[PDB]
Amino acid sequence: QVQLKESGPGLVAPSQSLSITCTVSGFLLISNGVHWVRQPPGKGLEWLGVIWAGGNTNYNSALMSRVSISKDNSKSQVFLKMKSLQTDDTAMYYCARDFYDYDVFYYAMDYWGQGTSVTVSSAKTTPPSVYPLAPGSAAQTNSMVTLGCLVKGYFPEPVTVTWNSGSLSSGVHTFPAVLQSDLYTLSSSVTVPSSTWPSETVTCNVAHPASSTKVDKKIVP
Amino acid sequence: VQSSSTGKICNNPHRILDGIDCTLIDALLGDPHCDVFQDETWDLFVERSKAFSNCYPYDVPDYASLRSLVASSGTLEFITEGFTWTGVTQNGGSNACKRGPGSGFFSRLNWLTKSGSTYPVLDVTMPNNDNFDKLYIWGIHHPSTNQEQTSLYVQASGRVTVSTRRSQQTIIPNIGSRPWVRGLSSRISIYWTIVKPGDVLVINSNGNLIAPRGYFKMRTGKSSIMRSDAPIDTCISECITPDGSIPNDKPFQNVNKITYGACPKYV
Amino acid sequence: QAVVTQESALTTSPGETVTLTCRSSTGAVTTSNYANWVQEKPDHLFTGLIGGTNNRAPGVPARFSGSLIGDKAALTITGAQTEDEAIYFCALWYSNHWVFGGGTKLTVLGQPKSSPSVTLFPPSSEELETNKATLVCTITDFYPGVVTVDWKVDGTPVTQGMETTQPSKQSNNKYMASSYLTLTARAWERHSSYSCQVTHEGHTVEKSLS
Ligand SMILES: [Zn+2]
Ligand SMILES: [Zn+2]
Ligand SMILES: [Zn+2]
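A: This is the predicted complex of the input protein with zinc ion.
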């Protein structure tokens, strides 16, 4: 069956050179073209360029000055090479197969790859500072007090938030990280009963594997 | 006079190849349903009636002649070759000749088409260094519309030139709508070339080429082709006719003007 | 080369017949464009759906149809099912150059509307000691998955230091989201009241502090 896989770096610093690889199986590069499509975080898709079966290529006018698609027909590999990388380039890079029907005469991108994520950052692995978050403005509304826990500026992903080392599970809501400055900030919140806090201790746990640091922080009222 | 056949065509002792529903030429070009006949060999190749093509609509001018030259050779041995087509998209195919999951074409032919923006001026050359002749087979595509012409080959009118040191065929496609066959009003036209040792096949084109994948090894015409719906039986017999086997004991037969093997003279 | 434009998101219900559309800044979308309709499912696993304007790709259920409706290209899901929720990308060919659309988010209402629980958190003494203050507003359990977050300082409208995460699906299939307001302790002292305004389904639910 058709099949395309992309294998790349995952993380490259601004001003270096990105080099993704699309290894196709089940069809020949002389029979079809291979396209490159990138999807930056929370954006639409962007078409990078295409290398035709005949080897000639066609690039996206914009990025053309930095892109360069090649291929080794005998290895079944297409190569997307980008230079002068800049942060914006953080995106999912996909290679999809170019199809053309000989009887109706139309182009189409039928086989999409699985994709491969590329983050362009100059940051060193840095553990997260963890500030506890308590209510403050006690409106005394209802029986469900909600505590929080900010996991500021770490890198790279992922961190692992936990409350009371797992004792608290009910409504632990842990949101996705964002990218303030150049590091990942993230937060998580557990909701408990007013007849539990400050009565009992609700502690926050942030293990961050990449930098072997694991901070626990007791949220005081 | 010998004037009667068993009615069957004995499997022994001549290697008799029953084409079932493929004619020789369909088996040669490689009609998907004749894939079974690849590299097959024979003394006598009997073509039945069932025979029906089932791939891209084609016509072979000089058919009965190309048919005979292959028939005699008695071998269908095809030899792939390293043709280098740089600038065009190979392996073209179609719905009127499906294979596997979809679009297919003649196994022994390579449909070239444009590579995105263009179709360069193709010009390969393949030398016959070997000690036997080579029988290349190629074709020219005739789109039925100028639209089709340009989608596939870009150029408004293509051309195919297949030269060797002594020949020179320059056929040019002919756009127009032929009758529908398996959904198509288009056609390909099968041509050929024999390359003698120390010669060079030279294909130059810029449109419509239906390139060769290699060559057919040609031995000496000892074999022969014959059309008959006669059954085949397990038996020994020397004289085969379209009607069947007839003993070669008498000096003159009057059963049929066509026969294979040490046969009585026709009357 | 040109700019393919299409609905940001569209919300339908099972049964209804929705029709995503695909416009060309450069004019009408002819057959020359080969309108491609790709379907992006969860966690970006794209799938081809229609090609060359109306040629249904194999796996694609019969209910998907490609067509030209006037001067723009279209796709029509006839009888949407919860399993049609997806971002539907439209791509238009312009001379050996492809141009995708912004994509459409298709919601297929399968559960009751849920209102978000909004929570505004004030900066922690700790974070303040290092002279930075970051307001955390955690919007959760909403449905359908779409809200707009707006910050306000002393009643006036904020336009800096706010970052809102995109909505994320929950285990219970409702949604969670998050927004941050980042200012320096100095600027955090400079004002009295801070508010986070969560706008979901016409109404706005805000929380505020001082
Ligand atoms: Zn909850
Ligand atoms: Zn004999
Ligand atoms: Zn103020």
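DSSP finds no helices and 18 strands in chain A. Chain A has two domains: 1-123, 124-221.
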